[PDB]
């Protein structure tokens, strides 16, 4: 609800998310942060105020607006040392950008190191006054957004480098156990007979969830901010950073129903209402559900998602039928992730500043072996063949600045150049299934753009490349405000323990 223009004050505070108390990074007093809203066409002016004091979770910050294209505003994209230097403690920085052509469910999170795990993360929804699916539901507001969070009792920079499971799943900021199975659960209210556009966002740093609601079907109308043909499911497997709008018809008996969100790892199952929340019909008692889980007969399959209005796949309906095709060979050496033999090490000068100060190709750009230049107005094919060489499957890869066509999904051997879904975060599957997840996009948006695994622990360990798209037009297409130009000198001046 906090309108198109708002202050985002970022501070440290103790939080009892799951009944356990620990210090964390919070936005306007709480984590996950407040929900940001606006309408398609709005100008978003988000003043991020860095009042952090704690070095262990990082005093500096940078916020990424997940799903937004940032066309002409690459500087505002967020990723530290790619699009900006971090905001320094005590200073504030304005993120100013328009959204003329996008509408849907989004989110925002720190894009400095693993900071967002320590709770710089929250939802962001842009409503469409002319939404094509508006006639399919009665209710769509703050109370229809559902966030999922993997919550850790030990801080990001304090625990294991690859945690492999959270202590508690949070649904709408609340969750349980297993050393605190009496903590408050989230309650979501429905009125029997009404239809709801529930906007599901994974704010997750790592795990994926099998999401379901006892006794109810779900009609998917949106995937990663892309309007989608109505698809009836009863189980959604949602990977880190992904979004779905589904319509729930409140057509069951007035009762309490278990909302379930089962992690792929960590504390699995539902003993004592862990990984759980409550769907409560108006009139039903303020108690826990007694509903029992049924087998998922219609699970979400990504190859069944198709865009609402026909949307052509870049290039031509043949393998390699594009201007530039790139394969991403994954690797891991015990502590570091490698793409095509290179592990991402953030440079001192943000890639953006390097281009504006007049780098011409990948060879002029630091983080060498990690930047790929892309020509403008071209079709691009990326493939991410799954391999045992990189531990921690399935890896959800995310592309900044673009939505892409998923011509080949995980768990499928078919290539769809006709009508596959477009999105911005995609599971790259498992080596065991011989997956070769393949995506396509159009270079219509000049600037440096991150492509990385949206398991934040893996990004931190270098699992990243940068697409330097249309270098010639970067500086001129992305004019930067002095506040942005000031960011680096101020941050670079800082002592190490004030970072
Ligand atoms: C009593 C003790 O061991 N203290 C530490 C605390 O310093 C640290 O902040 C936390 C990690 O988030 O773990 C532990 O509680
Ligand atoms: C930045 C740097 O020097 N890191 C390397 C890293 O690439 C490599 O994975 C490791 C061996 O496992 O040795 C070093 O620490
Ligand atoms: C939870 C966490 O992130 N760990 C530390 C915490 O031990 C310390 O007390 C605090 C400074 O007050 O900084 C942070
Ligand atoms: C972009 C890319 O690497 N495409 C490759 C192509 O170069 C190669 O001929 C073939 C090897 O079998 O696999 C595919
Ligand atoms: C599948 O992805 C690409 C296809 O372009 C191949 O080159 C690779 O070998 C993988 O198996
Ligand atoms: Cu993101
Ligand atoms: Cu993003
Ligand atoms: Cu990963
Ligand atoms: Cu990113």
mmCIF file with all atom_site columns, C-alpha atoms in Angstrom, residues 9 11 13-15 25-34 108 119-122:
data_model
loop_
_atom_site.group_PDB
_atom_site.id
_atom_site.type_symbol
_atom_site.label_atom_id
_atom_site.label_alt_id
_atom_site.label_comp_id
_atom_site.label_asym_id
_atom_site.label_entity_id
_atom_site.label_seq_id
_atom_site.pdbx_PDB_ins_code
_atom_site.Cartn_x
_atom_site.Cartn_y
_atom_site.Cartn_z
_atom_site.occupancy
_atom_site.B_iso_or_equiv
_atom_site.pdbx_formal_charge
_atom_site.auth_seq_id
_atom_site.auth_comp_id
_atom_site.auth_asym_id
_atom_site.auth_atom_id
_atom_site.pdbx_PDB_model_num
ATOM 1  C CA . UNK A 1 9   ? 14.270 3.264  5.979  1.00 0.00 ? 9   UNK A CA 1
ATOM 2  C CA . UNK A 1 11  ? 17.713 -0.400 10.076 1.00 0.00 ? 11  UNK A CA 1
ATOM 3  C CA . UNK A 1 13  ? 16.437 -4.612 14.998 1.00 0.00 ? 13  UNK A CA 1
ATOM 4  C CA . UNK A 1 14  ? 15.541 -7.774 16.906 1.00 0.00 ? 14  UNK A CA 1
ATOM 5  C CA . UNK A 1 15  ? 12.764 -9.851 15.336 1.00 0.00 ? 15  UNK A CA 1
ATOM 6  C CA . UNK A 1 25  ? 18.029 -6.089 8.673  1.00 0.00 ? 25  UNK A CA 1
ATOM 7  C CA . UNK A 1 26  ? 14.513 -4.607 8.548  1.00 0.00 ? 26  UNK A CA 1
ATOM 8  C CA . UNK A 1 27  ? 12.646 -2.189 6.303  1.00 0.00 ? 27  UNK A CA 1
ATOM 9  C CA . UNK A 1 28  ? 10.442 0.421  8.008  1.00 0.00 ? 28  UNK A CA 1
ATOM 10 C CA . UNK A 1 29  ? 10.651 -1.522 11.288 1.00 0.00 ? 29  UNK A CA 1
ATOM 11 C CA . UNK A 1 30  ? 9.809  -5.000 9.983  1.00 0.00 ? 30  UNK A CA 1
ATOM 12 C CA . UNK A 1 31  ? 10.806 -8.032 7.937  1.00 0.00 ? 31  UNK A CA 1
ATOM 13 C CA . UNK A 1 32  ? 9.732  -9.035 5.447  1.00 0.00 ? 32  UNK A CA 1
ATOM 14 C CA . UNK A 1 33  ? 9.433  -5.368 4.466  1.00 0.00 ? 33  UNK A CA 1
ATOM 15 C CA . UNK A 1 34  ? 6.278  -3.399 3.698  1.00 0.00 ? 34  UNK A CA 1
ATOM 16 C CA . UNK A 1 108 ? 12.463 -6.089 -3.810 1.00 0.00 ? 108 UNK A CA 1
ATOM 17 C CA . UNK A 1 119 ? 15.825 -9.895 5.835  1.00 0.00 ? 119 UNK A CA 1
ATOM 18 C CA . UNK A 1 120 ? 16.116 -6.987 3.435  1.00 0.00 ? 120 UNK A CA 1
ATOM 19 C CA . UNK A 1 121 ? 13.297 -8.437 1.350  1.00 0.00 ? 121 UNK A CA 1
ATOM 20 C CA . UNK A 1 122 ? 9.607  -7.675 0.693  1.00 0.00 ? 122 UNK A CA 1
#
